[PDB]
Amino acid sequence: LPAGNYILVGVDIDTTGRRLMDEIVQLAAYTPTDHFEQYIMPYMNLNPAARQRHQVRVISIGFYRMLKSMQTYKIIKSKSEIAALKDFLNWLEQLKTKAGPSSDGIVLIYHEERKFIPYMILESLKKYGLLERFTASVKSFANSINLAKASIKNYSLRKLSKILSLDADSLFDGNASVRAKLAFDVALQLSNSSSEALENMFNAIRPFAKLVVSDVLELDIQIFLNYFKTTLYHRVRAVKFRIVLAENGFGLDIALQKSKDKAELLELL
Template identity: 30%
Template sequence: MRLNKFVPSAMTRREDYTYKNKNTEMTNNSEEQQTSSSTEETIVEVVIQPPTPEAKVEFDASPAVITTQPAQPMPEHDDSIAVVMWEATVTGRRLIDEMINLGSFYVAQEEKAEGHDFNEYVMPYGKLPLNVIRNYNLRIVDTGRYRMLKEIRNNRMLKSKSEVAACNDFASWLIKLQKDNFPDKKIVLVFFEPRHSKILQLFQALERFRLLDDVNKILLGCVNGWDLLRQQVHDLKDEHRMVLKALADHHLGVDTPLESAVQRAQALHKILRKVHGGRINTGVLKENLISCDHLLEQVKKIKEELTKEAQWRPVFADMFRQGIKPRRRAGFLRHMLVESGITYVGLTETFKDKKDDGVVEVIKENIKGKNEADVEEVIKLLNQHLAQPDKPVRRGSGRRAPRTRSLCTATDLEKQQPASKIEPEENNNDPVKVIMDVIPSTPAVLSEV
């Protein structure tokens, strides 16, 4: 059987071609309709209006010129001021701490002027703290009969005086310096410290020893060199690097001595002179001047705050006898009470009338904006103390108890021994025995043989 292949005729080919053409025309028409609709939607008419006369005036106006303010010039040099550097070595930052070394330095602004320095050591009543021994190379030698200051590195004994004599010598040196070198000028003391602690100790000592009236006649005020260098030195912006050692290493050299107070005063003078361009600008010092009355007011204010803190001593006495963490905590809580204005006497009277509820009311009324845990701890401590004022509050510190001697007494030892072995005590206060010991015995007369 023979199979016949299907061969499409010409009619079928023509129909397929016409069908394809119709489909392509329909697709083209649909695309044209879509593009026309999209173009109609996106076309926006823009009408350009002629410029108004006001706009012409603004366009024709010249552009504004930005002017910068000129830098403020440096103040002029004041010839009525003499700059004297002052430094001290102290045992701490409190007013109760002691001064160990007083040093001062003065040199005229001329290039080849002779310098005048003052350096004296003071024998402190207490022991030197460890930071003073390490930083300033000093220690106290106690022989039993007398005490001496000694330099550890040079193994040299230092001549020291009392605080009264050292302050008197410093005041006399300032008066003589002003009288001999610049009788028509006033003195400005320049010190260097971020906190005004050393200079306050000096003014407290001068006021205590009645030397401040004589010093105020020649003293115009004080200037903190730390503030001056912080404003003008731009390469040491960090405050922790704004110490005299770092500044001396940067400007003067690594081997600059800074152990004694007079050496630090000389280094401060050289640094200020270099920063100011070879001559210390006294006009800048006058702008940053601190008056003597202001320093005395600060001393008075600190003493008043210490008096307010002392009234809370019975409450926090036990915490201050413990380690460093309880002591810091006690200081923080005590400062919070002092800052609020609550007095110990008033709180005691409130506790007698209203007991614990009265203490809670007073604390929450006066202490606001503080942490609730701190307020609750203060309330707990006050209630425990006021309930039993004679019994201190005990808190565990984790420290080892101090070693004590044996509690065995002499009577216990006597009970352990038999009565026959106990020797009676010798009575040295017997008048008959004392007289017999004093009167010498008459020598025997030897007969000649």
């Protein structure tokens, strides 16, 4: 990443799962001067692990689906994914505009062990053909988990929070808006240890900064055993079984409703 006058924004997302084929439920961004968050209505419902992590679930009142916070048991207002991304893109542009012509874009800062957040956001932008507009405002993604390891993998955003006393019973780390802020605050105090303090932060984040194009490239690349030995009839079907299961993201009988052999072989374990 080349040097210059960049804006720093912490980002994180709540999702229905940890796979690329899963969906975004919340998109959150933070700066000390401005913050953005929007809940998004997903196609699918949240699995048990997703409801546990974000404490949000989809409920149905007949035809009407809605997000409900498990904390307050109240309704979360939400938008479509496309609608929220436009709101996100409009918000990012205001940030760059507010910095003047001198600003050379925005650097999004996230904090996680496995690279996932940037891929999901980019995959959704490439979904609706909004990547070009995004490139105008944002110039790089940068993982901040590296600074922790450098100044101390197995450095959870929750653990660091306790160290710097940023943790609060009032703040739930399952919410993306909290993690976006904590990603920033953690990256702020460690980069240092007002205006001047931020200057130190860019320089500390530069090494781990990656160009958007680099991720878009890494995104594309990221995007029945016993049967293969016996005979041809079995071999063709196993490849069919491996492909069909993989596409759908892999009650057993109901989904299939021939395929019982898959169920018996799936019953086999």
